[PDB]
Amino acid sequence: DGRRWNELRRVHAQIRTQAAADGSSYLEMGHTKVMCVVTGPSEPGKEAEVVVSIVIAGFNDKRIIEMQSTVANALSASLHTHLFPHSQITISLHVLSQDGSLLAALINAATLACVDAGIPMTDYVVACTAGSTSENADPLLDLNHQEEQELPWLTVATLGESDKVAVLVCESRVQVSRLEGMLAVGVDGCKQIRAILDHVVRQKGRRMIRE
Amino acid sequence: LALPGQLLGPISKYQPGPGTHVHESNLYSSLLGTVHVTQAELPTISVSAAKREILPEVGNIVLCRVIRITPRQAVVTILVCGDTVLDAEWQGLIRVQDIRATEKDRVKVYESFRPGDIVRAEVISLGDQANYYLSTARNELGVILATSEAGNTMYPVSWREYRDPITGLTELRKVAKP
Amino acid sequence: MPREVEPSLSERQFVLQALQEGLRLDGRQLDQYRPLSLTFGDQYGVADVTFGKTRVLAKASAEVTVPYADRPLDGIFTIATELSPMTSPTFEVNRPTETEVLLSRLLEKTIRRSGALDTESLCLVAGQKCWSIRVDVHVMSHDGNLVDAACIAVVAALRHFRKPDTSIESGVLTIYTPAEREPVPLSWLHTPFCVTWSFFGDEGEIAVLDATWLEEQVRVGSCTISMNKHGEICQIAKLGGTPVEAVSLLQCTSIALTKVKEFSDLVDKKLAEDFKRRNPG
Amino acid sequence: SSDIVTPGELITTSPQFMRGHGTYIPPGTTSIISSVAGTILRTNKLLSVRPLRARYTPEVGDLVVGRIIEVQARRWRVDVGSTQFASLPLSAINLPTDELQMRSFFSEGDLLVAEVQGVYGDGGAVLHTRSLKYGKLRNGVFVAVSGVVRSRRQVWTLEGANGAGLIDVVLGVNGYVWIAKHTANMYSSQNDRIEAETMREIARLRGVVMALVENGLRVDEDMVMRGYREAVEMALVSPEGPEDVYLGGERGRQLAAALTA
Amino acid sequence: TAPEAALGVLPRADGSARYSHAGYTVTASVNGPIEAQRRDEHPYEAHVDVIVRPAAGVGGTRERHLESILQSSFAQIILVKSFPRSLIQIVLQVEESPENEYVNTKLVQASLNFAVMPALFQTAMLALLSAGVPMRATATATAIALASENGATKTLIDPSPRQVELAQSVHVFAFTSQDELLLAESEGDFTIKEWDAAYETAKNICCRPPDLRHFIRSTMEAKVATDLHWKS
Amino acid sequence: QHVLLSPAELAYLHASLSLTPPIRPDGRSPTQFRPLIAETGILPGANGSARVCFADGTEAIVGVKAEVEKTASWVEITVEIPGVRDDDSGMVFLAQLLGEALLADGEFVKKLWINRRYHWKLYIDILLISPPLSYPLPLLSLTTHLALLSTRLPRLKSEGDEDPYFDDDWAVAPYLFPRSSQPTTRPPITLLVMAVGNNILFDPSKEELAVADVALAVSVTATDVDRGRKLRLLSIRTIDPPSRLTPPGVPNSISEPIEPIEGVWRAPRGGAKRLVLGALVQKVLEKGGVVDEVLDALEGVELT
Amino acid sequence: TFPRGIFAKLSPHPYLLRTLCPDPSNSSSTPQRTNGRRPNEARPFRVNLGSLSHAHGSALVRAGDTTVLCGVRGEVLPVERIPLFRQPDVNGSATVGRGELKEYDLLVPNIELATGSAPQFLPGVPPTALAQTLSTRVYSLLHSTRLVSAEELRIWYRPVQDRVVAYWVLYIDLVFLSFDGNPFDVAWAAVVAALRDTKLPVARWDPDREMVVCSKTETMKLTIKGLPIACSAAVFLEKEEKNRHWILLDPDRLEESLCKEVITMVVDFSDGETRIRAIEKQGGTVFGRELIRSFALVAEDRWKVVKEVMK
Amino acid sequence: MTDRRRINGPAGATIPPVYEDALKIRSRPSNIIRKIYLKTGVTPSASGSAYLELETSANSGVSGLKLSCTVHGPRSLPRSSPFSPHMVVSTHVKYAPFATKQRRGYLRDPTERDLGIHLEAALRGAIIADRWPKSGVDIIISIIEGDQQGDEVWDMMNTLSGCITVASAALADAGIDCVDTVAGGVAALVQDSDGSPEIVVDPIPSEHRKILAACCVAYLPMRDEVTNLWFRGDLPASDMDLYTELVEKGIQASRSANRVLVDCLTETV
């Protein structure tokens, strides 16, 4: 442990990681690590279709397709899908390691992959996983894999700084009362993860415009 | 009765023809068959298998059955190629403009052809698509056999029209001059 | 065949405007839940739930099969939902559908996460024998909340089902023919229930509790909360939708529980009414 | 402009300004917020955002080279590198019944040069080859810059070197480049004789475009021409000889560094 | 004991029906002439598709046979010719089947179920008439099963599932309104002489001066008159 | 995979490669390989891992995980191309080729033997992060080789007659395929050899492969010298020239050309020629050959 | 005009009619179908046994073009693995289980139309409907026939109380290399032939190994009960005076395509009394009560020929 | 996992048969190729077909390996598939349920697909695809029996040689153009009483104590070309000269195999 509730796992984000891809991203939240490579708006050999493919590195097929459907729909609301009718957008995500909050890393890393590709985005879509931790209250922003088994875990994705939530998924039981405190926590985490994300986009651009 | 690859002839003596693959100035057979020679121009050699399953080639007469009739076209399976019945069946489409070159705008699919009939037509062109293209423009080309909407076999009365014998009803379709 | 039927745009406009005014094509307010009729088949373990025009029937099967090698200790529980060509002409047998895939997983988690069924009770012999409880969700007509109707049916069908009794003699288990021995109730700890919310306006402005089919094609996104009457929530599924502010989401959950309780009272009553007829006492 | 803008940044709330490509305005109350990560731009009292990186978007004047992907009847479909496949009508193509002979004029996988007659507005483009010059490419090698810069002339014929015949070079605004020997059966795929010396040099010219685009040094007629010149020198001075055409690896970076110098 | 059924049970469907007899409950959906997926589509005449949905479990290979039999028989009844490329979809879901108290449940079975067949043929015919699909004639089907333990032979009709296993032989028959056999299937050890007696016993359902012919008519009559109450 | 090319441009490539001096499109000499950027230990949580990148931009991450299993297949390969279903036939063949090389080594399998009734098993997962733009076997061979080198197998404190026991501290763990400093074996390499006419070329470019007259995949393993190396050939297989799957060229205006004209490219109908196959093998297996150059650089690659 | 063979592919049905009811000709005018075999005529069965070495029992059945290869594979199922096992009572000192073979699924048949079998049937596709419906048909008949006894498959411990350690499981898989004739007819006869050829190895449990064991050089033969054999036919009707009806026995593929009603009858004569094990008619009103009964006479004749083929 | 499509066995897993607790070299190497039996016309409905059998040892001991191939004529391709001027060639090989190990028909084992590509590589070179646009020839082989970690590859090579030999026969019966008949061949290196060097034209694995290396070639007689070669070994580079021989022995095997094919096709059809 050793982490204050407000505190989040160390994050290192890379943009345009792939030497030759329309858009790419690399996100590591603590131990979890995600790589994303996005084909640019392109037509296969009305609104545009997003395909999400998640490959878990060798260290449940239903769980994956559920995660794939989640990232796609979340990104699809932020992405200006309507602009290009005939084009298709493909998001390829590979997970090198897992420390829990995997879904959050994928949606965060993917949203970083999109802004790189230049596909128009209504706003950053960023998500974290928060839990109640049982009437004593120490709601947690970043959930370790250890912590998620012990405590109920809620994953929430927001449209950037706004309180609006595009995705909210919880597969572990909580009492209704605890929830109101859990989501706000997650929401607070999202803005933090946007902040690091916006810094990553801005720093690369400063070097790009310099270069 | 040469096997695939028999050294049929030096390129100088003869010219490549259907059933012959020429490599290194020594023409060779490409199918197991009985050879033939046609005999300004050098002679041409060919090898033919004993159903040939020939691919439709443009400008060839074909006999074909109409699966459906549609306003802008006709959809017809190419059941037979002249002198070779096709174990392999390839679909073929006939255009409204192609059915009769005279009075083009007046020509309508419904009046020209009807499902279940058998038509005789040339191949205007290769598919440019999954469905090969055909045309019945030539006067000789036309529905050769038909089944009435009632189901009675129909006997031709006039070039424009077919008569159902028992019904006495007449259906309009292009029929073949021959 | 076109894979999906699309509502005529002129129609799509009326429903959006009606909802904004608060008026609904169904003829009932947004908060409303369509009238529910739950009818149990005379045979044990069969339940038919009807919401408005949509009907889903669930039948429970419990074969004894060999356990998976991965987990010799736990028995298998499967919820099989199959969208049918009778449901709508579009749906084709032996071909997956996006709605069909999600319905099974969402429902499966709701029972499992609440854990009313015991994996410990299911196993008979650790090595080679385990129970195979199942519920087959048959969709008879597809209007609106197929998920919500299936949940109330699945939970009802399961409780009504009776396992073939088991007794171990000389340290040897014996699965008892129904004639040989009376059936056994389902060992049900607590009951989950599922409720689906649908949002129809950009920014998630409008929320509809129960969606008609026409309404279902128009709506931007939707969320489904799965909650036990006591308040323990087994699953929450806003898998995707136009951004809806959190405050409205939370408000919809408290309303949901009020809808869950009234469902729990009916089903428990309905189980009683039938039980009294079969076994007067 | 000076500072970068990120998606979600509110450019302005002022009414006077109007939406520009890259900027999305919330429904109802007027506000202008960026959708792309790009340097802000202020043209014609319209505020727009220029992506730091984005796919090629068509404009009417551009000259592009693309390979036909699908022969849709009543149409052709080309890969202009745009978000949506481009379409070439048969009516625009130079002609020597045409629909039956369509595949003869062009084939799937063929490569052409053409100028956008119109932009659909959905990102799609309509290409015309009616101009006499434009035709099927032939006697060359394909390269993809994946940058090219809009210039009045994106086609020139080089002197060549080491006794090589003049090498034509076509720089697509779209980002595809065709380097070939310079030299009505226009649509046939036969290739006139290409002398060995030319083949070597065609690659070097290809080397410059690749190294320069990689180096971030823009591509234009003078620069591409200049690279060949510096490259020829690099080889003569090189221990390897005049035939080390390959400009890849650091050696490519060096030619660019010299050009930037 | 006496057949009971209803029409229009499923509102959304072009036609729907529910039949209950001999402890068998079937609810069936019929969809009118429809555009046919080309792989399923046959051009000259329509293709009738039958889907048999088990009450529990998933469709067995036996379930594939039960549908093939039903399609061939019903196509003669239906007027395939009228609609060229249309697909007629018949979907049957069995809600309840008579329990076999003497054996625990087995989800997947390979054998051909002769006992469910008699209910399906009667169920579909009711639904198709609600759809209005053009038909040359109307047909009814029942099943007979013979048991020898009593000595000589005991005739058991509309058999239960436990009955067919104990019985020496099972036989299922189906008759058009013009009295002729559209389908007949039998399994077991029996003699043609015993079969003919089953055919004439089966013939009774078909010709009358239970009463199947009257049942279909009566069931239709009530809905027909109910529908035509507006004539007033 | 399966790049699409105009009839003409394919005609230019075939002729350029045919000329007595092999004038390749990029100016790379027959022996030279394109720049490659590689890392080892990239993948956490594995007994071994590796990653590689190409000039094409195609990239991959391969991981090797092992658990002793009672003495069934000793080495297991899994490939996960993004747009490819696991069932696809091509991948299973490719995986098989890679597997053939390792298992036929003898030294590698011998290395894995621990006890008569217990044996180490090597589970390899090869993942193509990049889009599958071009044929992928070249990258997979080097990546797998690198990861195998990085694979560390825990040291067994068992005397090696008894049921086995192992040590916790990973650093003690001996590297698989250790470095030279007993004779030191090298993990196997699997490379593609292309031939246009008489000329032979290596590290084939996607655009080059299309015009290929013949194409073979030769797999070799070496015994370190502790005239550089003694090399051993294990597996050879024929990759169908993608050439056959290509547009025909319309001659400038005879069902088959009586004579083969210059400008037209016709899919190469025949198969490989016997003389070409042996020389193609000879070049790869020659002492001081390209193989040693590649293998040594990979040994030079940083580890973890 | 009558272009020979060109005519047939067009207007196929009428061509069969002309040959079926020849006009007055300088010929016998015997009804000859396009196949060249009269309606009463039947395709000639040819069975060759013992072909497959790896399978426990093997049998090849040929009906002209149609061909079936059947193989019997024996596997041992531990009594502990099967759900619902209850030790049998050899003799009893009125309740019937579903069946030792059924409840334990001891016999697992499967009929596999090859992709090579027909232009009609091709690979890479989920199983075709005719292939699936035929498979269940063989299963159903095998349990109703009682062709293979359940008792023979049991494995007994033979302690020096005796108990069953396991049941032999017999897998039957069939593959059609070619399909130009009625499917089921050829298959069932092949299944019976293959089961007859089955020679499961004698098996004995070893107490020290605690594992069921089979003995090399030990041969036991499955005891088949009866020899049920089938004949199938289809009616051709002149419609597209009641329309003429002709009965066609052991049909060719084309005939199956242009005939909409079929009949298949399974009969055994071994007891010396004609016994009808199963009948099936579909798709027509031709096969009335009178036609059904007399088809058994054709079946009896078909049964008598098959036993000569099957030794 | 119970197929909705097919009949299913007992849920509990079955167990293979278990039995209670040194072949001499068969024949001369050069003529060692087992006598083969090839007949065209095995299946008429298909455009072409053929059946191949091999004798386990000596002459006519048993029919150990048996292949049946079905070639479908130039077949109209699927409408959705992209137009191809080249004839599509597709090979599907399925091991029958009867093998030393029961192989599910559905499985399409990884071992089986590997053969399909090789066979696809051998036949593809022989076929002339430029002459039949928009045409798809489907080659299908169903293997009745197999011949008889390291031992597996050798057995597989022999089955490949027969699959390319039947296919050439099949392609001929159908009017499918072929630059040359494609004949299968096998070769291997064995050690006998310290006689490590010798090469055997037909492997016959069980008889040989250990096999150092083996090659399977598909020589096109009359054209000096090998469409497909695959070889497994642990051969010292210094000893490479033998590899040339092993490869050359393989093609010498193919010419022998070709004799059966040419003879069957040449003999009254």
Give per-residue burial for A99-110: e unless 16+ CB within 10 Å, then b. Answer: bbbbbbbbbbbb
Query: Alpha-carbon distance D11 to D31, whole Å?
Result: 8
Residue E124: count other Cβ atoms within 10 Å of its Cβ.
27
Give per-residue burial for D168-191: e unless 16+ CB within 10 Å, then b. Answer: bbbbbbbbbbbbbbbeeeebbbbb
Pairing of strands A153-158, F230-238: unpaired
F259 touches chain B (CB under 8 A): yes
D252 touches chain F (CB under 8 A): no
Query: Alpha-carbon distance H249 to H189, whole Å?
Result: 10
- CB proximity under 8 Å: G 124-153 to B: none
DSSP conformation class of C204: G
Residues in B closer than 8 angstroms to F250, CB to CB, are none
Q: How far is B128 from chain D (nearest CA, A)?
A: 7
Q: If DSSP codes are grouped into helix, strand and coil, which group holds residue E49?
A: strand
Chain G residue whose CA is closest to E203: G289
Residues near E224 by beta carbon (within 8 Å), at least 6 away in sequence: none
Residues in H closer than 8 angstroms to B4, CB to CB, are 172, 177-181
Residues in E closer than 8 angstroms to H7, CB to CB, are 61, 110
Residues in G closer than 8 angstroms to C174, CB to CB, are 86
Give the one of A84, A115, A160 whose C-beta lies nearest to D84's C-beta.
A84
CA distances from F249 to C200, D137, E152 (A): 57, 14, 84
Chains F and B touch (3+ CB pairs under 8 A): yes
CA distances from G21 to G8, G31, G234, G245 (A): 16, 6, 17, 11
Dihedrals phi, psi of D132, to nearest 5 degrees: -65, -45
B125 touches chain D (CB under 8 A): yes
Q: Select from F155, F170, F138 the least CA-distant residue to F44.
A: F170
Instruction: Compute the Cα dihedral for C107, C110, C116, C121 and give only its sign.
Output: positive
G84 touches chain B (CB under 8 A): no
Q: Partners for H (CB, 8 Å, 3+ pairs)?
A: B, C, D, E, F, G
Contact C123, C23 (CB under 8 A): no
Q: If DSSP codes are grouped into helix, strand and coil, which group holds residue B89?
A: strand
Q: How far is D244 from chain H (nearest CA, A)?
A: 33
Chain D residue whose CA is closest to A208: D52
Give per-residue burial for F242-276: e unless 16+ CB within 10 Å, then b. Answer: bbbbbbbbeeeeeebeeeeeebbbbbbbbbbbbeb
Check residue A114 and give left, alpha or beta (phi > 0: left; psi -120 to 50: alpha): alpha
Q: How far is H220 from chain B (nearest CA, A)?
A: 9
H interface with C, Cβ–Cβ < 8 A, is 4, 11-13
Q: Partners for A (CB, 8 Å, 3+ pairs)?
A: C, D, F
Contact C137, C103 (CB under 8 A): yes
Q: Select from E35, E117, E18, E109 the least CA-distant residue to E73.
A: E117
Contact H206, H224 (CB under 8 A): no
CA distances from H168 to B20, F202, F240 (A): 17, 32, 18
Please answer yes or no on whether F127 and A53 come within 8 Å at the CB atom: no
Residues in C closer than 8 angstroms to H4, CB to CB, are 94
Contact A163, A171 (CB under 8 A): no
Query: Alpha-carbon distance H9 to G135, whole Å?
Result: 13
Chain F residue whose CA is closest to B17: F255
Give per-residue burial for H68-87: e unless 16+ CB within 10 Å, then b. Answer: bbbbbbbbbbeeeeebbbbb
Query: Alpha-carbon distance E157 to F162, whole Å?
Result: 72
D207 touches chain F (CB under 8 A): yes
Chain D residue whose CA is closest to A159: D8
Q: How far is B150 from chain G (nearest CA, A)?
A: 10
Query: Alpha-carbon distance D244 to F27, whole Å?
Result: 7
Rg, C-alpha atoms of chain B: 21
Please answer yes or no on whether G169 and H145 come within 8 Å at the CB atom: no
Give the one of G71, G108, G177 whose C-beta lies nearest to H43's C-beta.
G177
| Token pair of C130 as six digits | 């385990």
Residues in E closer than 8 angstroms to B68, CB to CB, are 43, 84-85
Please answer yes or no on whether E61 and H7 come within 8 Å at the CB atom: yes
Residue with the two structure tokens 């620069």: D223
Q: If DSSP codes are grouped into helix, strand and coil, which group holds residue E145?
A: strand
Letter for the amino acid at G202?
V
Pairing of strands C76-82, F118-119: unpaired
Query: Alpha-carbon distance C105 to C91, whole Å?
Result: 19
Sheet holding A49-56, edge to edge: A11-15, A23-29, A32-42, A88-97, A49-56
CB pairs under 8 A between B and G: 21
- CB proximity under 8 Å: C 160-199 to G: 174-175, 179
DSSP conformation class of H239: G
Q: Select from H65, H52, H54 the least CA-distant residue to H32.
A: H54
Residues in E closer than 8 angstroms to G137, CB to CB, are 65, 112
Contact D114, D134 (CB under 8 A): yes
Please answer yes or no on whether E55 and C59 come within 8 Å at the CB atom: yes
Give the one of F9, F19, F252 whose C-beta lies nearest to D188's C-beta.
F252
Residues in E closer than 8 angstroms to B67, CB to CB, are 43
Dihedrals phi, psi of D79, to nearest 5 degrees: -100, 100
Rg, C-alpha atoms of chain G: 23
Q: How far is E53 from chain H (nearest CA, A)?
A: 12
Query: Alpha-carbon distance C58 to G29, whole Å?
Result: 64
Give the one of B3, B53, B91 whose C-beta lies nearest to H266's C-beta.
B3
CB pairs under 8 A between F and H: 128
Give the one of D140, D244, D249 whose C-beta lies nearest to F12's C-beta.
D140
Cα–Cα–Cα angle for F99, F104, F109, nearest 5°?
Answer: 90
- To test the contact with chain B by mutation, choose from E35, E38, E41, E44 the residue with the greatest count of B C-beta atoms within 10 A, namely E44
B134 touches chain D (CB under 8 A): no
Chain H residue whose CA is closest to E54: H4
Instruction: Compute the Cα dihedral for A148, A150, A151, A152 and give only its sign.
Output: positive
Chain B residue whose CA is closest to D104: B128
Chains G and A touch (3+ CB pairs under 8 A): no
Please answer yes or no on whether B21 and F269 come within 8 Å at the CB atom: yes
Give the one of F63, F83, F130 whose C-beta lies nearest to A57's C-beta.
F63
Please answer yes or no on whether B115 and E85 come within 8 Å at the CB atom: no
Sheet holding H63-76, edge to edge: H36-40, H48-55, H63-76, H135-143, H88-95
Residues in D closer than 8 angstroms to A79, CB to CB, are none
Please answer yes or no on whether A43 and D51 come within 8 Å at the CB atom: no
| Token pair of A38 as six digits | 């996005």
Residues near E149 by beta carbon (within 8 Å), at least 6 away in sequence: none
Q: Select from H11, C73, C120, C70 the least CA-distant residue to G84.
A: H11
Q: If DSSP codes are grouped into helix, strand and coil, which group holds residue C125?
A: strand
Query: Alpha-carbon distance C217 to H92, whole Å?
Result: 43
Give me the helices (H) in chain C, please. Answer: 9-21, 98-114, 119-122, 146-160, 213-218, 246-278
- To test the contact with chain H by mutation, choose from F71, F93, F189 the residue with the greatest count of H C-beta atoms within 10 A, namely F93
